[PDB]
Amino acid sequence: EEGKLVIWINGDKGYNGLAEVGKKFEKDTGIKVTVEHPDKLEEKFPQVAATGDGPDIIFWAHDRFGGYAQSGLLAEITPDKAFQDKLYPFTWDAVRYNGKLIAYPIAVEALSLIYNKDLLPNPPKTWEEIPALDKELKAKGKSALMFNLQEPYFTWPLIAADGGYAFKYENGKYDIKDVGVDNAGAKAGLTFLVDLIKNKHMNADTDYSIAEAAFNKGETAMTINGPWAWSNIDTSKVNYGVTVLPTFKGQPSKPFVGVLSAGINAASPNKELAKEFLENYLLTDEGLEAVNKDKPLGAVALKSYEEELAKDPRIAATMENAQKGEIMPNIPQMSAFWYAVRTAVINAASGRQTVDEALKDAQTNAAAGAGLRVNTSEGVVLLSYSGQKTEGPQRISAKISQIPP
Amino acid sequence: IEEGKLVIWINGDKGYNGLAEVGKKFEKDTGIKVTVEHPDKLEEKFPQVAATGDGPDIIFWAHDRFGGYAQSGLLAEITPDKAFQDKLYPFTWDAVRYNGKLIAYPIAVEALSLIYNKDLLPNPPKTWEEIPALDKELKAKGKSALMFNLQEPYFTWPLIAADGGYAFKYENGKYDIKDVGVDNAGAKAGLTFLVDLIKNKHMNADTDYSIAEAAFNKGETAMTINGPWAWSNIDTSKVNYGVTVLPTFKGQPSKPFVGVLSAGINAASPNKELAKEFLENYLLTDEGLEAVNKDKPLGAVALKSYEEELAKDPRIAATMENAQKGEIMPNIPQMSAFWYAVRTAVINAASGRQTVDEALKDAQTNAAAGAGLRVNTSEGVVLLSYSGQKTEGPQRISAKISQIPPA
Amino acid sequence: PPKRLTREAMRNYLKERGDQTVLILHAKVAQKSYGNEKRFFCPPPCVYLMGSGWKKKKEQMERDGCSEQESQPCAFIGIGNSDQEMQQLNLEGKNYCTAKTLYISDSDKRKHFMLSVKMFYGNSDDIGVFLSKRIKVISKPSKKKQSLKNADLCIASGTKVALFNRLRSQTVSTRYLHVEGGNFHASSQQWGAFYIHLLDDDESEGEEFTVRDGYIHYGQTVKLVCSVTGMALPRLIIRKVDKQTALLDADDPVSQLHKCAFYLKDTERMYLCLSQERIIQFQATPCPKEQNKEMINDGASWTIISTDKAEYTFYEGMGPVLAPVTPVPVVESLQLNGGGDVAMLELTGQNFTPNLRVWFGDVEAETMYRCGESMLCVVPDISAFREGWRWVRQPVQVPVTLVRNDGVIYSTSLTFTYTPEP
Amino acid sequence: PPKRLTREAMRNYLKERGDQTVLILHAKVAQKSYGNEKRFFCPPPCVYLMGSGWKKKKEQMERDGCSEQESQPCAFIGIGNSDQEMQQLNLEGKNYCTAKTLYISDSDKRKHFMLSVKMFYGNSDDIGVFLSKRIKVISKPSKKLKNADLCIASGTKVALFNRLRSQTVSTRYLHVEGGNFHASSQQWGAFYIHLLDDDESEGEEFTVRDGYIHYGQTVKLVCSVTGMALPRLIIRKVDKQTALLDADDPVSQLHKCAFYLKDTERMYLCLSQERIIQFQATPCEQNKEMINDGASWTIISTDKAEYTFYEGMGPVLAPVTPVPVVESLQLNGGGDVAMLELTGQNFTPNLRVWFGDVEAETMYRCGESMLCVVPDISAFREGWRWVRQPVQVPVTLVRNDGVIYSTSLTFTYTPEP
DNA sequence: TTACTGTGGGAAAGA
DNA sequence: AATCTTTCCCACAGT
DNA sequence: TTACTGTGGGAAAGA
DNA sequence: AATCTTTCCCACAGT
Ligand SMILES: OC[C@H]1O[C@H](O[C@H]2[C@H](O)[C@@H](O)[C@@H](O)O[C@@H]2CO)[C@H](O)[C@@H](O)[C@@H]1O
Ligand SMILES: OC[C@H]1O[C@H](O[C@H]2[C@H](O)[C@@H](O)[C@@H](O)O[C@@H]2CO)[C@H](O)[C@@H](O)[C@@H]1O
Fold first, then answer.
1. Which cysteines bridge via disulfide bonds (chain A)?
2. What CATH number should be reported for the domain whose range is C1-148+307-328?
3. Are C346 and C358 in contact (CB under 8 A)?
């Protein structure tokens, strides 16, 4: 459709705040803006966009955009130097795929430990001390921890802490063959989560809404969530704190750092109207304020608004957890990686598969060219292969032959 | 012990004829006859003869055995003047200190180094793991890669320590006589590697000091592990040798046990002043230490003046690098029991009599009375210990005095 | 009697690698012949014999009493239908032979076919049958609008293409773009495979260039790089040729067997032309009627067609075999599997048979056959590679090789690695 | 029927510790009686009943209908001889009793012996037999290097009694009651005789030197029960009725000796009836000083036999004895699984080593050696305590009928990286 | 002049 | 119905 | 004075 | 020969 903007954003984000930005754009230019939050839009978008349909603008963390760019569903964004300087260079690095900007970064988001100050004034510095806190709280008819166990994003900080990793960063690229989903570190992390479930400290059936209800109702002492969750805790009568995630085996929990990005559909006929709305309306102090007022964005990409929000202890806590963590790869392999870790976490938590069997299957499911770690009489050995080389570099070196006149 | 004559005991691998020259000088100056002896197993012999009130006047051994000798009351207290104490390095005096008392005179700092044949091997291996590959090459040339004393734990300890093995942990300002690192993963990896070199015919379990010394000096083996004392015999054999850093194990440095050759005075000896005279004014001099070093090298001597002149030597520079990577041995009485336990483990593991795990586990609980034991569990390594009845000995007693009435 | 391959025999092969390779170079499409007409496959399918195994086999046969004629490899080529007669290729002397008179009739109702190359030695000893890659049958080149939906008929950036020129008035009726002695020329006998790379409209001329992905459309800037020598022609603009005129106003996707024109980027209307065996430039005269069309001769009018390559490598590991060495297996990809009890390696490819075993170095693996495209094997334990002096815990790299029950060794470009971890 | 101890029952015991302890305090030596003479063991062997278990047992028995006489623990003491009669001890009212008239005859040719204490409740219910430590028989005290068994070492317990022939109470004993030193007629204390350097000043904190105690040495007598110490004193030899300043001989068993108070005007440790005071010695020979009978004490090394038990699964038909005593522990890594070797006495095949509330596989070697399979750390990770953390548990011996034999030893599992 | 035969271009038939 | 694909037809090129 | 009985001191045998 | 240990004997203490 032409003459109107269709925007897709996740339901856990500030969509009503973004709709206010759409009503401002409609009163200024006369172009109607429709903000939608469909379920599983990360899966929906590549299906609708392939046929040439779907939204004009897509809002998701940078990690899914690399595959969307590879499939040719995204338009190349080409902003001016004056505009590029208004946003942090590392935020632009997250939205860069094959030397091309494929989306507009909006906000840097990381998981933090959200604790109830009345129930727990001093939050645990380690994961290992949580079962002891659970005994104390259970006596008071409460529980220690409750977080989303259906989404690997929330369990990844624990898997990464002792040594787990998605893809290794070698030279100036990600090694799409080097997956650390079945290493000792990943195994120790998932074993600990499974032990919390087996010992009734946590329930395998816990999702986002179940954990959010329990924290906001004051039933659970702690939760693991991002900046977007702060607004609902504010409306509830909870004296909460946002702090560093607890350490595992003396090492910091490494959450996956996401950059909320807005891409433009390649099939969209309103590419200039999308650029106008995103640059001059959304990525402004007033524009970003509207979205943040509904549901907090985190550390915004716009330098001017970030400076005003930096003084917030909750955003200061998000950045500390972001620094200890890692920016997600935007590479196309990320989708396959996430599906493999989701399956492993669920099957290990339910008791369907052992931790070893779940992470071993996840390892070889994550990248197609990935290795496999085996337990031998001499120790742990990584099995790998090479020789089917298929890529073709971005730059080609070839000697020019003369065509005689 | 006869009055008017000095009896000295020193190990056979040391410069005893050089020390005898020092004795001849003392005899021509004061008129007191000096007898230098090198009996077999003198570290075991001395506490037996000294207990009855016999044995030598002066005892030469590394500082590690002197703690037990002092505890048994076999050694006389060393009380030198400030002018003399300053002539020797403070750390050398620290090795000879037991319960705030100096129990011996320090002579030289000694550490094991890798001694290689430059003609057979110009570039020595930086790691232990590459030695079997170097052995295949040498075996083709009718030679071997490595040969060292496998009957004495001192030589195998650098490998055992490298990955995580230790004798006693140093907690606060003391050694924890209950914390023994003999059956840990690091020690196990080190002894497994040595046993693997033996099982794969790269080394022979029956190899002792003399067998390995013959093979190196005859040019049959490319490398040996030995101390400064061994350099003199290699010099007479005219082997183009090199003294370098011990190879690394699992990427970590080999940690040799640093020894300080010390001279203690028997508590039963009636010539304590004659012993002090000979040791301070004759042996611990540039001329005195030169005589011993000329026979068999001492290493890095405790006397500052002579050490400065010997520091330029690349072989002593190599000994110090290996010493710095290693640790100065404890002097505590438990050292004797520790050594016997590690000797047994190394021999039984090499011979195939016991597995590495079984040998190192037995050694751990035999190393000290009240030592723990490590176990491999489904949750990881666990240290088993018991808070039993550790001897200790309360030194200070707190008791309120009840007064006796004057009536 | 057939002998199974021994570890000693495998060790010797891995050191020498005296392989016998058979290469089939052809176009991905073929135009149908109607009535009694014969529309020959262009460029002509080529059969190359590579590897030191051929000389080794000749010398072995001649020690058995063979004459040079008896030891000489012979080859015949045809399409997968018995109704058409197989044509002889003359390898004798040369390392290759091109089939100049192959065609597919209207009677042959197949939508896709493979070329069948029947090889044997002059003494009648059978080598085997080697098939090409799939060739799609086309009625005529698409004279109208093309789309990415017909991807089979479209040309993608970074893919190999052949460029030929039809010259009706000239003695040599058809010439082919080829590179000989580090120079571009219009060969009458040989043809080159060129990677057609797409570049951004702002990319300047040079030895180093950034290649953009996607299907090639007319008016776009392309770099033609020789797949053999790595030699590239200067930046060209691919344009649609109509009868004897190149049209500048074309944006349509470039399709199979289309009439082409290659204008040199940033030049005074100069295009890629041919003067006998040599390639030169040509000055285009613009039409006074249409400012979007330019006059270009027959020598400037080229024909684009996507090309493929079939490769088969074999070796008689346990000496001469009674049975032919074919169908020769080809391994496309590998994937490890941790879903089961023991670590498994899944092989994807073609021509797999139950009588094959995967070997990791000189270590024969327990192999499970599923179908001609899928085979599984039990990854050997690292201890299998710690047998002698190599007992130290260290990284181990070994080749992956397929072996037949009669000792025939099928080489692979894939290696396997065991990496110890702390 | 006998019941094996349950984990719940063990958990309750470890929390409460309402044990029944039997103490036998006696001298390490005994003087032989010749002819028809009766030379009584001095100080008198004492039998003490310690622990809150006694009152618990009394209260339980009384809920069963027992009278105070029926619930009252009774004890008989003798030597290990089937010719000499066992003497009744009267515990009724108190928790202790002394055996004032025990002796060893010339007919008894044993070079050593142990006291046998047969205990039972008034209703005839048998508690069991409790032996003392070894008592060496001596002919007479040596007025002398060859025998260390007759010598007194620094830090060892001694009893100090005073023979008063002219007084109504023929013998008084040094004891501490109500935080004060006195000469008791009924009770006697065990005192650690510590040797200190001649330059060590008077004070609550003092450094103790090692070695055998000789005359002229500065001694510190510390009460083994209260921890009360007398001011610095010099142990001197006593000849007839004189204190010998010029004595360097080693102090031996059953020796007459004096205790001069350090840095005083000839003041010695004396007694006036039940109270201990200081006596001024008149010098007579400049090395000898006149001292009365009250200043003349007798030194003798003492020992202590201790037995602790608890009916973990309620009343038991069989006696609680022999009560096993654990002297030491040692771990063993020479075998397939980790083993704990127990050294001590009174071990039986009906015993099991427990690590907390975890019963271990126990192997009986002999009455002096016991082996057990050290439980896996997982046995102590059964509840919410599943997290990898240090675990400390008591070591306890348990009989098949539920009788719990307490130990002063703990076991520790320490996780390591 | 005509016969010889692959080939691109174009129209007419199908999808 | 268009627009694309398939089938049929024919001029053109040289000894 | 002496009888009554445990106890240290001393002499005379043994080791 | 010493020096230590064992055995036997006896004065001493207050009713
Ligand atoms: O759980 C896998 C999932 O993780 C991340 O998604 C986050 C998202 O980034 C947050 O902004 C928020 O919406 O929660 C999501 C998880 O519920 C990845 O961005 C996503 O691609 C991946 O599927
Ligand atoms: O092998 C055990 C042994 O090691 C050390 O002895 C060394 C000595 O320090 C060196 O100077 C040289 O003589 O070699 C000896 C080994 O044969 C310890 O000092 C010693 O106590 C220990 O038993």
1. none
2. 2.60.40.1450
3. no
CA distance D218 to D215: 9
Ligand 2 environment, Cβ below 6 A: B 11, 13, 43, 62, 64-65, 110, 152-154, 227, 259, 339
Alpha carbons A127 and A155: distance in angstroms, whole number: 12
- Whether CB of C143 is under 7 Å from strand F: the answer is yes
- Residue A347 CB neighbour total at 10 angstroms: 18
State whether the beta carbon of C38 lies below 7 angstroms from any atom of strand E: yes
Q: Which atom of ligand 1 is nearest to the CA of A151?
A: 1
Residue of C370, C362, C372 lying closest to C403 (CA atoms): C362
Has domain D146-301 been given CATH number 3.40.50.2300?
A: no
Question: Dihedral through CA C255, CA C260, CA C265, CA C266, nearest 10?
Answer: -130
Among B129, B135, B136, beta carbon nearest to C394: B129
Q: Closest Cα to residue D258, out of D283, D295, D290, D222?
A: D295
3-state class percentages of chain D: helix first, strand second, coil last, to nearest 5: 5, 45, 45
Q: Which of residues 264-323 of C touch strand F (CB under 7 A)?
A: none
**Sheet with C115-121, side-by-side order of all strands:** C87-89, C73-79, C115-121, C126-131
Token pair, residue C155, equals: 């040309």
Q: What is the identity of the amino acid at C269?
A: R
Cα(A196) to ligand 1 centroid in Å equals 23
Does the distance separating the beta carbons of C389 and B129 come in below 8 Å?
no
Yes or no: is domain D324-417 CATH 3.30.365.10?
no
Q: Do domains C1-148+307-328 and C329-422 have the same CATH topology?
A: yes
Q: Which residues of D touch B400 (CB under 8 A)?
A: 179, 204, 227-229
Quick check: A188 and A117 in contact, CB under 8 A? no
Q: How far apart (Å, rounded) are the C-alpha atoms in residues B351 and B346? A: 9
Q: Nearest nucleotide (C1') to the CA of residue C146?
A: F4
Q: Which residue CA neighbors atom 14 of ligand 2 most closely? A: B154
Cis peptide, bond prior to residue C327, ω within 30 of zero: yes
CA pair distance D405, D190, nearest whole angstrom: 26
- Would you call D416 and B364 a contact, using CB atoms and an 8 Å cutoff? no
Q: Locate tokens 């971005």: which residue?
A: A394
- Domains of chain D: which residue ranges? 1-145+302-323, 146-301, 324-417
CB-neighbour burial class of residue A54 (10 A; exposed 0-12, middle 13-18, buried 19+): buried
- Is the domain spanning C149-306 CATH 3.50.50.60? The answer is no
Which residues of chain A neighbour D387 with C-beta distances below 8 Å?
128-129, 131-132
User: Is the CB of D389 less than 8 angstroms away from the CB of A128?
Assistant: yes
* Nearest residue to H4 via alpha carbon and C1': D144
| Tokens linked to C330 | 């080809």
Q: What subunits touch chain D, counting only 3 or more CB pairs under 8 A? A: A, B
Q: What does this entry list as its resolution, in Å?
A: 2.8
Give, in Å, how far the C1' of E11 lies from the CA of C242: 17
Give me the sheet containing A112-116, strands edge to edge. A143-145, A220-225, A112-116, A240-243
Chain C residues in contact with A404 by the CB 8 A cut-off are: 278-281
- Fold classification of D1-145+302-323 (topology level): Immunoglobulin-like (2.60.40)
Q: Which fold has domain C329-422?
A: Immunoglobulin-like (2.60.40)
- Scan for tokens 């390696």, then name that residue: C345
| Alpha-carbon distance D209 to nearest alpha carbon in chain B (angstroms) | 8
CA dist D236 to B41, C100, C313, D249, Å? 47, 131, 108, 10
Q: Exposed, middle or buried, C321 (CB in 10 Å: 0-12/13-18/19+)?
A: middle
Other CB atoms within a 10 A radius of the CB of residue B125 amount to 20
